[PDB]
Amino acid sequence: SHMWIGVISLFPEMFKAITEFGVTGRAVKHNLLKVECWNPRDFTFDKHKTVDDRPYGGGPGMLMMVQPLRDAIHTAKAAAGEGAKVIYLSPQGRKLDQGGVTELAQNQKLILVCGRYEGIDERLIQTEIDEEWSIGDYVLTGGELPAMTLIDAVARFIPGVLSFADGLLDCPHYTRPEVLEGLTVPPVLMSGHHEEIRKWRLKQSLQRTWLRRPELLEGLALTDEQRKLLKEAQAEHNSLEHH
Amino acid sequence: SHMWIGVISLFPEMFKAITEFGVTGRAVKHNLLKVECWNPRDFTFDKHKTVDDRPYGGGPGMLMMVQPLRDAIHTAKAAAGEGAKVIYLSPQGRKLDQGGVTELAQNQKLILVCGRYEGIDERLIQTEIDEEWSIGDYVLTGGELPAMTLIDAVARFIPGVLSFADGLLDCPHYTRPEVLEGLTVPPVLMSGHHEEIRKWRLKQSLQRTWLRRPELLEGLALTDEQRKLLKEAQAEHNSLEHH
Numbered sequence: 001s002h003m004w005i006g007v008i009s010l011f012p013e014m015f016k017a018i019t020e021f022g023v024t025g026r027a028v029k030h031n032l033l034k035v036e037c038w039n040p041r042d043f044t045f046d047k048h049k050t051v052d053d054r055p056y057g058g059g060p061g062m063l064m065m066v067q068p069l070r071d072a073i074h075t076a077k078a079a080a081g082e083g084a085k086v087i088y089l090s091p092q093g094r095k096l097d098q099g100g101v102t103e104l105a106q107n108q109k110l111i112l113v114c115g116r117y118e119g120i121d122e123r124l125i126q127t128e129i130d131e132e133w134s135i136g137d138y139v140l141t142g143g144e145l146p147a148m149t150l151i152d153a154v155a156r157f158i159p160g161v162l163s164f165a166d167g168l169l170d171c172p173h174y175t176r177p178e179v180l181e182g183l184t185v186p187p188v189l190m191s192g193h194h195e196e197i198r199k200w201r202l203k204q205s206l207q208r209t210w211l212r213r214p215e216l217l218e219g220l221a222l223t224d225e226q227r228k229l230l231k232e233a234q235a236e237h238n239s240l241e242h243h
Numbered sequence: 244s245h246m247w248i249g250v251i252s253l254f255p256e257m258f259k260a261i262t263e264f265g266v267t268g269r270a271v272k273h274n275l276l277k278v279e280c281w282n283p284r285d286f287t288f289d290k291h292k293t294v295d296d297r298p299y300g301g302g303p304g305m306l307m308m309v310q311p312l313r314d315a316i317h318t319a320k321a322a323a324g325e326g327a328k329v330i331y332l333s334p335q336g337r338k339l340d341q342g343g344v345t346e347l348a349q350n351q352k353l354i355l356v357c358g359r360y361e362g363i364d365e366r367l368i369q370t371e372i373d374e375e376w377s378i379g380d381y382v383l384t385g386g387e388l389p390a391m392t393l394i395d396a397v398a399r400f401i402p403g404v405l406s407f408a409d410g411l412l413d414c415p416h417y418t419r420p421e422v423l424e425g426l427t428v429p430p431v432l433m434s435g436h437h438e439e440i441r442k443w444r445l446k447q448s449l450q451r452t453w454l455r456r457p458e459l460l461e462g463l464a465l466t467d468e469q470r471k472l473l474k475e476a477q478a479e480h481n482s483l484e485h486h
């Protein structure tokens with residue numbers, strides 16, 4: 001495969017969401033993407049296969065038990081061999097964005113550690129984790145959805161698998177029928193004028209980014225054409241009434 | 244249930260990832276959370292149950308076919324009744340954060356529309372969607388992971404189901420053993436001094452937010468105690484060498 005992803009999770013079956021459906025599912029079946037899981041529960045030795053433990057200092061909540069998690073990570077690393085970057089999904093990590101996605105996609109092998117409960121022992125992050133990554137400034141019940149989000153995002157960059165690509169939001173899209181609940185498709189999109197359509201899409205992207213995410217535009221070096229189309233969109237905006 | 248979530252998706256089975264595992268799975272089995280899905284494919288009438296269509300204006304890629312998607316949405320709305328907010332998962336939507344999560348959790352009913360391909364017809368967003376929400380500045384293959392991310396995040400606020408809660412990152416956590424690969428647990432956490440432990444955790448949160456996400460601190464009104472602990476952490480930081 002082009003990319004191999006090792007996963008450490010108490011719920012391996014959750015990953016069927018990406019390995020059995022859609023473009024990511026096709027990529028897996030076609031060996032373009034490989035997702036292999038290791039479950040800490042399989043590395044426990046007590047009668048009840050305990051995978052959590054008490055946090056020192058008290059306070060509510062539990063943490064992932066160290067030994068089972070550590071052993072699971074070691075096994076994954078052994079299978080991945082040298083060169084596999086180990087990532088821990090955490091809201092305290094680097095916030096994921098398209099730039100980070102392209103960076104991550106440069107790796108041939110990745111091992112994703114998914115926590116549960118209140119998280120994992122800080123010392124494991126220091127001794128076993130290479131990088132911490134967050135999918136957003138919000139808290140989820142576990143690292144599985146974040147891991148799948150990361151896998152899905154990077155998979156789009158694997159040759160054969162298939163906004164922010166140019167630092168801009170995407171333009172509106174339209175399909176049949178020509179008229180929907182009284183709303184028509186913009187005439188230009190049905191003119192067959194390839195060049196005019198290209199400009200419409202670019203101008204729409206610029207206008208939408210300016211109106212919805214003006215911050216994204218600031219840290220962007222626009223081409224001469226982009227500067228022109230944006231100025232046109234803003235002039236058009238200033239010639240109209242607004243709510 | 245406390246919260247009902249209707250979902251429109253071409254891959255309903257993906258949602259088992261949250262309805263069959265962990266705390267969210269328990270919440271569903273216990274009727275605290277209800278997730279009901281409608282699949283556009285079930286609303287098609289042609290022999291091959293076509294769910295995509297060509298975008299006007301050409302260009303690579305396809306879009307969700309309007310009729311099957313529209314009909315699926317209408318059915319969900321009929322089942323939800325009045326008061327159900329309809330959300331479309333999209334990278335052009337409002338970027339999700341803990342504040343947005345708490346806002347969304349105030350809804351008793353939500354309908355989440357998951358797109359695939361290049362997205363959906365802009366006119367449907369205008370006629371059927373109330374709000375657009377993004378889980379991050381990156382692009383995924385479909386709206387299912389984003390929808391599950393939103394559901395998981397809001398579920399944590401449903402009574403009985405169970406960083407950024409106080410606008411700060413969480414503190415480090417530790418569990419057995421006392422010594423791990425030569426690294427010991429901070430002595431204070433094993434002192435049994437409740438008050439000192441509380442302060443250590445708060446100071447750690449402040450220090451970590453300052454070092455990793457200084458922007459988060461700016462737009463925050465710190466209490467007197469928080470201002471003191473942060474100043475102490477910064478003074479401690481300035482008394483040491485750094486890499």
Ligand SMILES: Nc1ncnc2c1ncn2[C@@H]1O[C@H](CSCC[C@H](N)C(=O)O)[C@@H](O)[C@H]1O
Pocket residue numbers: 089090091092114115116117118119120133134135136137138139140141142143144146406412413
């Ligand atoms: N936005 C996010 N991105 C990546 N992983 C996330 C996430 N929200 C939750 N998780 C992961 O899910 C698990 C349970 S959440 C524990 C959260 C903890 N109090 C803290 O703020 O660090 C953890 O392993 C956590 O890192």
Ligand SMILES: Nc1ncnc2c1ncn2[C@@H]1O[C@H](CSCC[C@H](N)C(=O)O)[C@@H](O)[C@H]1O
Pocket residue numbers: 163169170332333334335357358359360361362363376377378379380381382383384385386387389
């Ligand atoms: N970060 C994100 N948050 C919410 N939904 C997302 C997402 N990334 C992808 N999707 C959703 O997954 C589907 C396929 S991605 C189509 C993306 C399109 N070119 C655009 O930038 O709008 C769409 O319905 C899209 O809205």
